[PDB]
């Protein structure tokens, strides 16, 4: 009978972290992303590693 009371509170805090995760995630992922390509040279760091794949994948 004790456990139920406790487990409810545990279950809420887990479920609230998952919801905060989805919502945090949806805002985070929707907010930040832009500088990879607003710096076109952070797609040059892709091109750089890709030229170091070009040469240095083999």
């Amino acid at each position: 009978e004790v456990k139920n009371r406790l487990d409810y509170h545990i279950s809420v805090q887990n479920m609230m972290r998952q919801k905060e995760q989805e919502h945090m995630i949806n805002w985070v992922e929707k907010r930040v992303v832009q500088s990879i390509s607003a710096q076109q040279e952070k797609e040059t760091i892709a091109k750089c590693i890709a030229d170091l794949k070009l040469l240095s994948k083999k």
Binding site: V2, R5, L6, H9, N14
Partner: protein
Amino acid sequence: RKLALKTIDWVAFGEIIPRNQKAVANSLKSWNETLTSRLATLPEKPPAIDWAYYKANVAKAGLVDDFEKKFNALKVPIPEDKYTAQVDAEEKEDVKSCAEFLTQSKTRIQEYEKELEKMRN
């Protein structure tokens, strides 16, 4: 209360003949024996709480601690029971055994076995 046991001696148990309590014994064996094995089942107690943890992820930990202190403090009364008149419902059909046939039988046995010797002559 909890479990008890007395003089469970099943053969003579049913055998009683105080008729409105005679019948009872025959069933009371099986009620009992079922009982005895059914207790023989259970655990007595369950775990002891990991309170250190439940504070962790019940971060309404006032609740945990409230219930923790309460659980640490929480000590059940014991059960109810009522048929300790059976103790004395015994003593009546405890004198029946005695009086009726304790004494009758010694009396009777005396004359008869004595009654062997003299007519053995």
